Amino acid sequence: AQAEIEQELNSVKDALRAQVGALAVTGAEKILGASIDANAHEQLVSKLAA
């Protein structure tokens, strides 16, 4: 019974880490604010990496 109680808690903790927190993939909105200056830095980074 005590092992089943720990399994319930870790399923809630993981479901919270997956539903909420992982909502931070909305960092695309922050990144949406990028422009041609930043693009040039990413092209240089890509070129240095083949």
């Binding site: 019974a1 005590q2 089943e4 109680i5 319930e8």
Partner: protein, 52 residues
């Protein structure tokens, strides 16, 4: 009287063997219920703890 004494001696041992079998089977029934009592009590407390 000797034939009757042998029949009484034979009855006594067969009656003791029948009594012994009843004693063992009654103890087996009590043993079986002792484990069921403990299982139902343990399951009940497990459900109480997880619901809380």
């Amino acid at each position: 009287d000797l034939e009757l004494a042998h029949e009484k001696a034979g009855q006594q041992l067969r009656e003791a063997k029948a009594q012994a079998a009843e004693i063992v089977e009654q103890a087996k029934k009590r043993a079986n219920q002792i484990v069921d009592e403990a299982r139902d009590q343990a399951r009940t407390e497990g459900e109480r703890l997880k619901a809380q």
